[PDB]
């Protein structure tokens, strides 16, 4: 038999900046958002779900310098916590 399912569910998007605004990339060090995300994923994947990790990434950008940006979580339809369980 046929059943109904939500057309859009279990998505999360994470953008490098807020709408209208620039995102920064160092010529040798790479994109600041990308580098910051990797660092947080390496540290917190073991203990935090993805939504929590992304929030921590946002917090790390809180104090604006000469090259400011605020990463944004978008269009979230995660119905559960997504833990990566690294090593498993």
């Amino acid at each position: 038999a046929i059943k109904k399912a939500h057309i859009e569910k279990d998505f999360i998007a994470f953008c490098s900046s807020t709408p209208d605004n620039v995102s920064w990339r160092h010529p040798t060090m790479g994109s600041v958002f990308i580098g910051r995300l990797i660092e947080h994923m390496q540290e917190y994947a073991c203990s935090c779900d993805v939504e929590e990790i992304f929030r921590k990434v946002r917090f790390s950008f809180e104090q604006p310098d000469g090259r400011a940006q605020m990463p944004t979580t978008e269009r979230v339809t995660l119905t559960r916590c997504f833990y990566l369980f690294p090593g498993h």
């Binding site: 709408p19 994109s31 994923m41 390496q42 916590c81 997504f82 833990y83």
Partner: protein, 173 residues
Amino acid sequence: TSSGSEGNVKLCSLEEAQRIWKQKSAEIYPIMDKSSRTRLALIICNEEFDSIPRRTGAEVDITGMTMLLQNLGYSVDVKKNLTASDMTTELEAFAHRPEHKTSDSTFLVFMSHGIQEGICGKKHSEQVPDILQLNAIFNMLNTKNCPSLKDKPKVIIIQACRGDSPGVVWFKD
């Protein structure tokens, strides 16, 4: 040690995993058996463009993200210097991959120049725009267009400007 498959990603221990499964009841996405699962991830990165400046340092981003996603158990497909049409074709191919059926999740990474409207393709100019919209990414990966990822987390990561503004305002202390 960082010699293993997980590299520099800190491991979740057995005690940590069970604490996670105890603190929260039935509100965690299920993970498939490590021995049999076929996790896929896609990275699309545009560095060399026709009309807009070269994204120097993009190779560092590619390396870091590719290794991280591998560390996390994903097989990573890396695609470079694509038009918006090429990105659409690649995303459609990715959604059709047989591995998603025996996977529990996916990561999509997009890295390029960006404007208000979306993500720039290799041929982008102000006169003739070449833009992939975020809405298209979602549409191509949803339950209709990618039934194999039904009920599974789909994580989209986007490195790009979203306009010309510095994203700041002044205040006095």
